[PDB]
Amino acid sequence: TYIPMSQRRSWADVKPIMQDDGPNPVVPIMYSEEYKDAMDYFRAIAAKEEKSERALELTEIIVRMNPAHYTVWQYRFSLLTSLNKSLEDELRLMNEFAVQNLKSYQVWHHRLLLLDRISPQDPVSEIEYIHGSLLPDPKNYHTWAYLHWLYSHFSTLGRISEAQWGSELDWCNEMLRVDGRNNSAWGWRWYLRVSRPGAETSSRSLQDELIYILKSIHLIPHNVSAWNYLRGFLKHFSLPLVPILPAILPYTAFGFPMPSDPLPEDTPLPVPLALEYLADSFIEQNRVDDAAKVFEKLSSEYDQMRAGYWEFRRRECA
Amino acid sequence: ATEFTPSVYSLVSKPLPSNSRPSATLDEQAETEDLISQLFDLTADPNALVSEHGKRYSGLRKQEHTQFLASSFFQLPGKFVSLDASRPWLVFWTVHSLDLLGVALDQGTKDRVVSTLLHFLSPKGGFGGGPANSQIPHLLPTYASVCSLAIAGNDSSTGGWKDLAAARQSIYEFFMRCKRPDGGFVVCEGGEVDVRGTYCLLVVATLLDIITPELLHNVDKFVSACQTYEGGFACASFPFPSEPSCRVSMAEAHGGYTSCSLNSHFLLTSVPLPSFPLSIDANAALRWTVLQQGEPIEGGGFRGRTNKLVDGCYSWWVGGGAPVAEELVRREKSRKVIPPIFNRVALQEFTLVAAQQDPGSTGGLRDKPGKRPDQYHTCNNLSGLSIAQHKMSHSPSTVSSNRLKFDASKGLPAVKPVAPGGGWKNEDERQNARREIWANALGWIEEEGGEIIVGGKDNRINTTTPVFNILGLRLKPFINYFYCQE
Ligand SMILES: CCC[C@H]1CN(c2cccc(OC(F)(F)F)c2)C(=O)CN1Cc1cncn1Cc1ccc(Br)cc1
Ligand SMILES: O=S(=O)(O)C[C@H](O)CNC1CCCCC1
Ligand SMILES: O=S(=O)(O)C[C@H](O)CNC1CCCCC1
Ligand SMILES: O=S(=O)(O)C[C@H](O)CNC1CCCCC1
Ligand SMILES: [Zn+2]
């Protein structure tokens, strides 16, 4: 049986404060007794600006019932810092919230604030936790954004070693080996190899990256993630499309990877993004009529869901 | 008008090929293709003159959807507690959907909406997700409350707009407390930083005439650095210090953050500051937008990111971003000196056939088959359906006519900036800013003759506005109130 807080000796000094909705609010929610009672006492705690262990316990009760309650999370973090609580213990509590499927923008942001304030000399333990947490959802957007933030923040402090960057690419390569269609892991590869400020740009690194992209396309020719990464790569580094055309032309029906002599089964031709590559390489050669003819086929035969877009591109050729 | 918008029923439906390379992504894609294509198979083609016997009729079940939303004005069950910090969104999703569906609220119910929202307004500035004695202000409930007051309020003494006007300085001060030096904003005290906050803040600042130079500094750079190599936008960018030496996008391109980024950047192009806003790659954003429309076997709905599943709410996020991307491309084509840009027919077919709750049930619209309908997917499906039905464009001649009628001698008191040099330089510059921002905010039109109503005129819903996502007949008197025009 539930015991109301008005009947708890530890709370006898506190006068609860009711929610001030007005007399007949729209979108009212039928709250459980436990949740209303806890919020009635939270309003009083926050009114008197009490920073205490009982206030800390109360915030945990509330965010277990509603993990998206940003006001109570904000109050909880100020309780932790005011009381100089163990932030490593709090991080262990957040590990449980993930386990019991308590999640939101607010919980993820709480974890970031903890890491920021702990400011570990080496964040390797948190990196490994984040990697393991991707097991039930390898495309969790919050998790990938948090991983980006963690490496960016701690690299700004000089705390990501060359060995650490190297094993992060190793982990990224394995993620794409298990599912080459994971566009989140492709985005992470872009950070690791291209956009992060410490990335190497040399003729070797450009050659290596192009080899990995082309091998990935030859493994899964219909994988949009690989085509988009190829197009972004070439564009970002101002590299011509034409010299690579030998590897792309077999999909539109020399040193760098070529398609399998017989193509993999279940690979119907043409691949529409291969045709887009061909049209753009025609434009690079100033062969606008040839480009227009390819756009026209994309519009009327091969990618008809985008008939209007491909017609727009066709008309731009004139 | 449908030459380049083929119906899903007229195209060959075929699965995403496997290349003999199975993966978890492909397992889910194939299962979703089966769900959606089977429902299309049981449903009569909306484009037929007489509906087929034995098959489901796809007409928009407007009265079912109205009844679904009606719970908002009585009570929500106890499992709504997860949205207890989002109650202004429950209001907005309800009252904007009713506007789209053409259903009027009586004055007593509108007055309850206004009164409820004003209890969420805190005296120090901004709306929270619930009562001000319970929740701190937040940028996202502030947008939802402001737009809801545009839909349900009025200019009288009980209409709420008068209270908003009196709160302009405190809301501005809340916005400046949220501001980061790099151009991001926290969504609330101690809250996260992303382009949802930027979008919500810029909409409200535009509508209430509280934009200043100090408010906008670096905001364009934060947003522009969110663009990824795919052409869409991520949630945020990270500033690396020597202001920052460079900024890097923090996650993958996503339909919701791409909408927020395109809309934010579009609102900034109205602001007459020198070399502002920093440009984006509009062509790449348009390309990314159109590539997210699904194949015929998935009903022509939009996905929110590459290699994930279609979902009706991206009809608004991605589809509603298309006219903005199109306008930015047009401006750049003009600067360097006609068919629809996505399949407007197929998106409507997805909405009617796949996103409606099955008939004779709760009503409402949903993510996809197999998912319960909710208020958020009801609003976003209908907002995206509106964009597909009505051809929206930003009209330079309309903006020009707006400039010609603006009265700069009318307006509310100028906001007092936080820092001494943070305001406009003089009245000539401030009034020029007010004129440009007002005149462009009112520049969206529906093109005469561009209407496409799949399934017949009984499926027509009202026209929403790109960027703001409220009806033009709400936007115009609301923004005119705060700028003291007509
Ligand atoms: C209760 C609705 C939850 C929904 C929408 N939502 C949101 C709420 C208020 C405002 C807002 O944005 C803005 F700018 F303030 F209006 C966005 C979320 O946070 C998460 N969502 C989950 C979801 C459903 N189907 C796709 N998603 C992913 C997704 C992620 C980010 C974005 Br953006 C859009 C969709
Ligand atoms: O699908 S909707 O248009 O939203 C509403 C439902 O059709 C209700 N149908 C009624 C059945 C009995 C006769 C009166 C109409
Ligand atoms: O005077 S104002 O600052 O504008 C309004 C109050 O201070 C804010 N109310 C608090 C919100 C969070 C829970 C406890 C009450
Ligand atoms: O205006 S038109 O597009 O020519 C045709 C009408 O809208 C047809 N709507 C149906 C009528 C019968 C009941 C179900 C809806
Ligand atoms: Zn959705």
DSSP per residue, B127-142: B-SS-TTT----HHHH
- Please tell me which residue in B162, B374, B403, B460 is annotated as part of the active site: B374
Q: Is B313 annotated as a binding residue?
A: yes
From CA A6, how far away is CA B85, in angstroms rounded? 25
Q: Which ligand is nearest to the CA of A73?
A: 3
**Could you give the 3-state DSSP secondary structure of residue B211?**
coil
What token pair was written down for B83?
A: 């949205």
- CA–CA dist A122, B460 (Å, integer): 59
Paired with B239 in beta bridges are B247
Q: Is B182 annotated as a binding residue?
A: no
- C-alpha closest to that of A241 among A201, A199, A213, A270: A213
Which of B352, B452, B457 should be mutated for ligand 4, with most atoms under 8 A from CB? B457
User: Residues B248, B251, B255, B256: is their CA dihedral positive or negative?
Assistant: negative
Distance CA(A34)–CA(B173), nearest Å, equals: 36
Distance B61 CA to ligand 2 centre (A): 8
Residues with CB under 6 A from ligand 3: A 43, 46-47, 71; B 122-124, 132-136
- Residue A221: Cβ-neighbour burial (10 angstroms; 0-12, 13-18, 19+): buried
3-state class of B392 per DSSP? Answer: strand
Reply yes or no on whether B313 is catalytic: yes
Q: Return the residue whose CA atom lies nearest to atom 15 of ligand 4.
A: B458
Give the environment of ion ligand 5: residues with CB less than 5 A. B 311, 313, 367
Determine, for residues B16 and A65 on separate chains, whether the beta-carbon distance falls below 8 Å: no
| CB distance B140 to B200 below 8 Å | yes
B95 touches B151 (CB < 8 A): yes
The identity of residue B409, as a single letter, is S
Contact in structure between B265 and B277 (CB atoms under 8 Å): yes
Establish if B128 touches chain A: CB-CB under 8 angstroms: yes
Contact between B142 and B118 (Cβ < 8 Å): no
Vertex B195: Cα angle to B446 and B113 (nearest 5): 65
Q: CA-CA distances (angstroms) from residue B461 to A118, B273, B377, B458?
A: 53, 38, 16, 8
* Catalytic residue list contains B476: no
Q: Is B67 a pocket residue for ligand 2 (Cβ < 6 Å)?
A: no
CA distance B133 to A18: 9
Residue A103 annotated to the active site: yes
The size of chain B, in residues, is 486
From the candidates B79, B84, B330, which should be mutated to test the interface with A, based on the most A CB atoms within 10 A? B84
Contact A233, A209 (CB under 8 A): yes
Residue located nearest, by CA, to atom 11 of ligand 4? B458
Residue A14 forms beta bridges with which residues?
none
Nearest to B263 by CA among B210, B201, B214: B201
Q: Which residue in B122, B63, B108, B116 sits closest to B92, CA to CA?
A: B116
CB A218 within 8 Å of CB A244: no
CA distances from B104 to A60, B145, B387, B463 (A): 42, 19, 21, 15
Closest CA to A205 of A189, A184, A220: A189
User: Residue B247, SS3?
Assistant: strand
Q: Which residues of A touch B322 (CB under 8 A)?
A: none
How far is Cα A196 from Cα B240, in angstroms, rounded to an integer?
A: 10
Ligand 4: does its nearest atom lie under 6 Å from the Cβ of B457?
yes
DSSP B350: I
- Which of the following is catalytic: B308, B403, B460, B476? B308
Max CA distance (Å), chain A: 85
Of B138, B200, B311, B474, the catalytic one is B311
The shortest C-alpha distance from A10 to chain B (Å) reads 22
Nearest to B43 by CA among B349, B248, B344: B349
CB contact under 8 A, B17 and A67: no
- Residue B254: both structure tokens together: 């996503």
Which residues neighbour B312 within 8 Å (Cβ) at sequence distance 6 or greater?
A: B301, B350, B351, B354, B355, B365, B366, B367, B368, B377, B380, B381, B384
Residues 6+ apart with CB under 8 A from B375: B69, B72, B89, B90, B93, B94, B97, B364
Q: How far apart are CA B286 and CA B319, in angstroms?
A: 11
Q: Which residue of B73, B82, B135 is in closest CB contact with A71?
A: B135
Name the B residues in 346-365 with CB < 8 Å from any A CB.
Answer: 346
Given the residues B313, B368, B435, B481, select the one marked as catalytic: B313
Provide the pairing of β-strand B392-394 with B246-249. Answer: unpaired
Give the whole-angstrom CA distance, residue A187 versus residue B232: 12
Ligand 4, pocket-test mutation among B352, B453, B458, most atoms within 8 A of CB: B458
C-alpha B364/C-alpha B377 separation (Å) is 8
Most A CBs within 10 A among B3, B4, B226, B332, hence the mutation to make, goes to B4
Helix, strand, coil tally for chain A in percent (to 5):
65, 0, 35
Which run of H or of E encompasses B445?
Answer: strand B444-446
Q: Establish if B306 touches chain A: CB-CB under 8 angstroms.
A: yes
Closest residue, chain A, to B113 (C-alpha): A26
- Locate A28 and state its tokens: 């009212």
**Separation in Å, CA of B133 to nearest CA in chain A:** 6
What's the CA-to-centroid distance between B313 and ligand 5, angstroms? 4
DSSP E strands in B213-305: the ranges are 237-240, 246-249
A55 HSE (CA, 13 A, CB side): 24
Q: Do residues A20 and B134 make contact, with C-beta atoms less than 8 angstroms apart?
A: yes
Q: What residues in B contact A305, CB-CB < 8 Å?
A: 6, 11, 293-296, 300, 343, 346
Buried b (16+ CB within 10 A) or exposed e, B130-155: bbbbbbbbbbbbbbbbbbbbbbbbbe
Place of tokens 């670096």: B218
* CA B285 – ligand 1 centroid, Å: 20
In terms of Cβ atoms closer than 10 Å to its own Cβ (0-12, 13-18, 19+), residue A312 is buried
Supply the DSSP symbol for B239: E
Positive or negative: CA dihedral B115, B189, B215, B257: negative
Spatial separation of the C-alpha atoms in residues B311 and B366, rounded to whole Å: 8
CB contact under 8 A, A265 and B20: yes
Contacts of B77 in chain A (CB under 8 A): 30
For residue B403 the two structure tokens come to: 């400039």
Query: H or E element: which one contains A4?
Result: none
Q: Which of residues 408-437 of B touch A (CB under 8 A)?
A: none
Could you confirm whether B27 is annotated as catalytic?
A: no
CA dist., res. B438 & res. A151, Å (int)? 42
> N- to C-terminal Cα distance for chain A?
78
Look at ligand 1, atom 4, and give the residue with the nearest C-alpha.
Answer: B376
Q: Ligand 2 in contact with B61 (CB < 6 A)?
A: yes
Q: How far apart are CA B93 and CA B95, in angstroms?
A: 6
Q: Which of A36, A85, A103, A293 is catalytic?
A: A103
B410 a catalytic residue = no
Asked if B131 lies within 8 A of A20 by C-beta distance, the reply is: yes
β-partners of residue B356 are B365
B65 in a known ligand binding site: no
Residue nearest atom 14 in ligand 4 by C-alpha distance? B59
A295-301 LR contacts (CB < 8 Å, sep 24+): A298/A272, A299/B4
B63 lines ligand 2 (CB under 6 A): yes
**Are the Cβ atoms of B85 and A24 closer than 8 angstroms?**
no
Contact A59, A75 (CB under 8 A): yes
Residues A10 and A285: their CA atoms lie apart, in Å, by: 80
